[PDB]
Design a protein around this ligand. Structure first.
Ligand SMILES: Nc1nc(-c2ccc(C(F)(F)F)cc2)cc(N2CCOCC2)n1
Ligand SMILES: Nc1nc(-c2ccc(C(F)(F)F)cc2)cc(N2CCOCC2)n1
Ligand SMILES: Nc1nc(-c2ccc(C(F)(F)F)cc2)cc(N2CCOCC2)n1
Ligand SMILES: Nc1nc(-c2ccc(C(F)(F)F)cc2)cc(N2CCOCC2)n1
Ligand SMILES: Nc1nc(-c2ccc(C(F)(F)F)cc2)cc(N2CCOCC2)n1
Ligand SMILES: *[C@@H]1O[C@H](CO)[C@@H](O)[C@H](O)[C@H]1NC(C)=O
Ligand SMILES: *[C@@H]1O[C@H](CO)[C@@H](O)[C@H](O)[C@H]1NC(C)=O
Ligand SMILES: *[C@@H]1O[C@H](CO)[C@@H](O)[C@H](O)[C@H]1NC(C)=O
Ligand SMILES: *[C@@H]1O[C@H](CO)[C@@H](O)[C@H](O)[C@H]1NC(C)=O
Ligand SMILES: *[C@@H]1O[C@H](CO)[C@@H](O)[C@H](O)[C@H]1NC(C)=O
Lengths: 205, 207, 213, 208, 207
């Protein structure tokens, strides 16, 4: 796991095999991407205009098996800059600002061909904050899917509630759930898979 | 369609597109202007200021055109592919009454279809100066957005327009009507005519 | 001629010739004479004003033109003009002496190059300036100046020649703006500073405006 | 040696040699031992404080050093150190876990390379953090806790090792009572392996 | 003879072939003498509570690299060059509390005798003593500018005729005095000295 030249070699191999603009399909099956959200913070919450500002830890994984190697005497994982990798084109449907990445833009590649990209993000969303002061709290739903690939090319999926959530927040997390969802729009005949993350939270009392 | 996931067939189409594609040159065919279809679909309203007459909107910008030099036989290969928009010509659209840089909320990819059609449909948050009077009244306020090609006159580029289903439930405002008109203006600066789509939007507060 | 404007292959060749000849970092001087650059502002919107700090926020259309005849070609059977990315062309290095923010370009960064070596670049720009705003409430309006000059090139290399004057200054201006424009004028100035024995040419633009209603 | 240092050609050759031996995307691990990165925060200012929202704005000088023997050269008759743009060098991927903004880098982005293989990267950063701010308008003051860790590399590849009004501003509204720096290894339920990090405790109060 | 376009492009080519942008241009084993002056253009704001100050200043940097020099007998005396092609000094304000914002194009003059001039106009926020701004004596704010990564054996900053000369007449504030001075500090992390120039600005509000 710890020879610089072995790492430089693995990296070199990934840079040949990997085509960054082409989706990594195997055997006529959609690429199976698994998304999961962990919340880190809730910073602002406007009940008049229906917006929140959050920081979340976005764990995405997929399998590009052509990147795989034998690791019996070499390292099992390495870090690659994401400009050298195809990453999925996920978008959050009810975002109202550009996503702001707060972490170095690197992925792990695992010798079985698995790719993990888990950046931490700040973003404002437009959502229902009705009930944020009550005891049963508000429920804001976030929708996240593949922007330009339909369900026959990219298949999204959902992989404790407050394990990484700051203790210095004004808000508290009651429950967080994730549901897979295939949806068609009147524009395009094809479906787009998304994950709907439903966060249930309230102000602290 | 059944052959939509050959990673190799896909890579080959991307390669092909990158060779034929001339990103800086308008893809005219047969001495006709490029016809570009332009439409908005509103997603949200974020800020309304009745004093200064401004509005923040997130709208979904539907833009399509064709370049038959990119076409291919898709009988046994993928029907569409995604392409980074730096590899294709894109039209230089501009909103005349906009007062801030447009902010693109989605990945900057276009779809290319086997028949030579190109679809670029970004989601955009932008700020416009427009008439926002009547917004607390039953008829509502009517605000227009004028979107035309900036450098190419009508002789080279024409823009044509092709209810808020994708409009947020949680917005403070409600849409009443959305119409789309085609204008063709000659400015006192240049002897030629620039075309544009006008998008009139009637909207009002809820309660 | 206008009849051949669209032939895709012809346009590409013109774009190719332009890149082979254009030197983006060199002033296109002709015959021991300075490069003449025509400058015209047209105001679009006056976004905000602060009478206490003396700042304004404007959107203007900045029309700029100049000649490089080494770019010319025979338009007898060819497109008369084409659009070019400005990264492929020399562009004048104009600065706003009293800008207090970076310029934000609103529009696509493309120039039109015409078949006789004329280049037009007219972006739309939002910028914040520092100027005299007192009077803005009265009926005679306020009067705010903006100096714009060549930063690193002096008069014998670049001369900004005033493109004035209107009609017409209230034409591209938002009618839905809190403010209205009385008059606009332009002046060519030529200043020699402490540092350099060389003189820099600038264009002073005066905008007279008041709050409506 | 100190005499050499000013030879424009000698430096050019050193800088050439570094760009060739340096691979920016590979951790400079030697001997099967995890790269040791020494980190150190010196505070410079405390600017925006919100007691209601638990946010703070700080300008701090981050001091980072590590060792890469492959970059080393015989400096008997050449310069002992040179400046290098960090685009030419591997730099560790550090990240503040409680930062709620993107770091704003206030200084030129150069590192120093010493001829014995030490690399020194010491940028001045402004950044907003989410932390315990209550107690700030009182004498024992507040106690914030920034944590700085290796994002994608775990303990077997990168290991952080720790190491104060000297560089702090006397024109700050705030003043500093104590600063401590502990090493911390923690395992998150996602990945089997542990990540090293440095909890920097800052103790400070408003004036008067 | 300053305008022959071919002579310019040739000079610009010679400059790119011999110039190494990442290497300090030292000569005869002496440090590089970088000369620095600040002329103030404006003051945007002042916060008495927090000791912040927003200022627009014209930074005047000049230094020599005799390896760029050419014979200007029948070619131009000077030319403009993108700073990406040249080595440029890594200056920094110790008491800056914001990213510097360059308001001007990033071009340097090169003079044929080997001299380089980089003179950008900059907008930056500083933290400094601001008390006394309303009083007739005025407040005194100190900016400390120095070389960040290069110590004194490598780069030395030397300050080089009245202010209120490029200073905006429309400012709330007026400048009472400006003095430049040179210090040389060693910090407890590293045994080599770093030179800086402290610009002292004495100013007050107007009546
Ligand atoms: N997942 C997803 N994808 C698209 C989409 C479809 C096609 C294109 C294309 F091909 F034109 F580039 C772009 C986006 C649009 C879309 N919606 C648009 C309206 O807001 C809800 C989501 N959602
Ligand atoms: N569509 C459009 N195009 C232009 C335009 C822009 C650039 C050029 C040039 F010089 F590059 F050729 C010409 C016209 C100007 C224009 N107007 C200018 C003022 O605002 C209303 C619209 N509208
Ligand atoms: N047109 C113009 N050019 C300069 C100028 C800029 C850069 C250089 C240098 F050093 F790069 F050569 C010289 C003069 C400075 C200048 N002024 C600076 C002070 O405010 C009034 C305008 N105006
Ligand atoms: N040092 C560190 N690293 C991670 C982490 C980031 C990326 C990856 C991946 F996907 F690249 F493998 C793994 C762990 C996560 C993490 N924390 C978990 C999120 O909350 C803050 C602390 N801390
Ligand atoms: N001019 C200067 N340089 C440094 C400095 C910067 C980088 C490095 C390193 F590590 F990259 F070599 C060393 C010292 C530090 C420094 N100060 C330390 C605190 O901030 C005020 C002054 N001032
Ligand atoms: C993996 O490692 C080496 C050769 O690469 C060898 O010991 C072993 O047989 C390999 N196993 C597989 C499944 O290729
Ligand atoms: C499309 O491709 C296949 C193979 O070349 C062929 O069967 C079919 O006739 C082609 N169609 C056209 C339009 O040429
Ligand atoms: C352009 O016109 C002719 C015909 O295209 C060409 O041969 C000649 O070089 C040019 N001269 C004229 C007539 O402008
Ligand atoms: C380095 O070079 C010097 C001078 O050439 C020589 O004396 C020495 O043996 C070399 N080895 C070391 C000390 O690394
Ligand atoms: C330029 O010509 C020569 C050769 O470059 C040079 O040495 C001298 O300084 C100049 N000659 C004149 C005419 O002054």
């Amino acid at each position: 796991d710890d020879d610089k030249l072995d790492r430089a070699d693995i990296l070199y191999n990934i840079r040949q095999t990997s085509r960054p603009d082409v989706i990594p399909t195997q055997r006529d099956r959609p690429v199976a991407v698994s998304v999961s959200l962990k919340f880190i913070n809730i910073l602002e919450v406007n009940e008049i205009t229906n917006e929140v500002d959050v920081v979340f830890w976005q764990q995405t994984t997929w399998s590009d098996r052509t990147l795989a190697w034998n690791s019996s005497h070499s390292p099992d994982q390495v870090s690659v800059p994401i400009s050298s990798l195809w990453v999925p084109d996920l978008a959050a449907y009810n975002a109202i600002s550009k996503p702001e990445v707060l972490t170095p833009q690197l992925a792990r590649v695992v010798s079985d061909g698995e790719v993990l990209y888990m950046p931490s993000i700040r973003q404002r969303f437009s959502c229902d904050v009705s009930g944020v002061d009550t005891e049963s709290g508000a429920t804001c739903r976030i929708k996240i899917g593949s922007w330009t690939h339909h369900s026959r090319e990219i298949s999204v999926d959902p992989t404790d509630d407050s394990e990484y959530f700051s203790q210095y927040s004004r808000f508290e997390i009651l429950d967080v759930t994730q549901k897979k969802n295939s949806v068609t729009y009147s524009c395009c005949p094809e479906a787009y898979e998304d994950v709907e993350v439903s966060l249930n939270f309230r102000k602290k009392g």
